[PDB]
């Protein structure tokens, strides 16, 4: 099996979310830091 890390995309400009726990929690990704 492939572990518990994923990215979810939305439709808006830079709208990308990271999860380390198979979707239990999400943070917005700041590509500028």
């Amino acid at each position: 099996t492939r572990g518990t890390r994923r990215i979810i995309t939305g439709e808006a400009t830079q709208e990308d979310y990271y999860t380390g726990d198979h979707y239990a929690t999400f943070s917005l990704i700041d590509k500028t830091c």
Partner: protein
């Protein structure tokens, strides 16, 4: 609820690999990469079916 906003430099380097492949529409390492994410727990804001898609971030040693 979305738990704040994390710097890309504070994530694993494999997250930058995933972002590069999303921009080129692949090729992807896993069958589930590019499928619709349903958001059935309402953790993310509610949107139409097909607004959200899912992609693997590789964990070194996890096949």
């Amino acid at each position: 609820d979305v738990s704040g906003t994390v710097c890309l430099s504070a994530l694993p380097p494999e997250a930058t690999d995933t972002l590069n492949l999303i921009a080129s529409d692949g090729p992807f390492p896993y069958s589930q990469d590019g499928v619709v994410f349903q958001n059935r727990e309402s953790v993310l804001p509610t949107q139409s079916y097909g607004y959200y898609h899912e992609y693997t971030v590789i964990t070194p040693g996890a096949r």
